[PDB]
C-alpha cells in the first residue's frame, strides 16, 4: 500500500501544482497533519512555495509551526527540518516562528 517515497512524491506533486488555490493549500496541510508522521522537508518545501505563489506569508509561518507541533516530544525533528529548509527560507524571505517571536507563550 505505497512506499514512503511514493507517499512523499504524491504530496510534493500536490503542493507543486502551479495554480493550486487557497482552498487546496489548506485542505492539503490540514489533511497531511492527520497522519502519523512529520512531513519530509521536501513536502514542506513544496507547501511553502505554494504559499509564495498564493502571496500568503502567514500560512508559510503556520506551516513551520505545525511541523514543530507534529514532532511532539521529539525535540530534534524541528531544528533538523528548519536546517534542511534554510535555502528555501532564505530564497523566499520566510522568517521562522522563532525569528518572529511567535514561539513565546
Amino acid at each position: 500500500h505505497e512506499t514512503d517515497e511514493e507517499f512523499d512524491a504524491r504530496w510534493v506533486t500536490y503542493f507543486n501544482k502551479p495554480d493550486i488555490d487557497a482552498w487546496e493549500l489548506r485542505k492539503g496541510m490540514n489533511t497531511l497533519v492527520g497522519y502519523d508522521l512529520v512531513p519530509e522537508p521536501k513536502i514542506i518545501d513544496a507547501a511553502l512555495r505554494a504559499c509564495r505563489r498564493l502571496n500568503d506569508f502567514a500560512s508559510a509561518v503556520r506551516i513551520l509551526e505545525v511541523v514543530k507541533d507534529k514532532a511532539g516530544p521529539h525535540k530534534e525533528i524541528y531544528p533538523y527540518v528548519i536546517q534542511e529548509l534554510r535555502p528555501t527560507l532564505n530564497e523566499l524571505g520566510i522568517s521562522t516562528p522563532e525569528e518572529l517571536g511567535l514561539d513565546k507563550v
Binding site: 502519523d36 508522521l37 521529539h74 533538523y80
Partner: protein, 73 residues
Amino acid sequence: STALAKPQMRGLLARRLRFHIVGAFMVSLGFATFYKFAVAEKRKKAYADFYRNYDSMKDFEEMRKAGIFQSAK
C-alpha cells in the same frame, strides 16, 4: 559548524504504542508470577500446611475445655 542528523520522522505514534504494549505485556506476566507466589500459592500452602497434621479431635477438645459449646461441656 555542525549540521544535525536526520531523525526518525514517520510512525512515531505507532512506534511508541508498540513499545509500550509490549512492555505492558511483560509487566502483566511479571504480575501474574508475583500474584501466584504471593496470593494463590500462599493460600494453597497455608491450607495444606494447616491440615497436614491437623487433629480434629484435639481441636474439639480444646474448644470444649474453653467452654464454647452448647452440646459439649
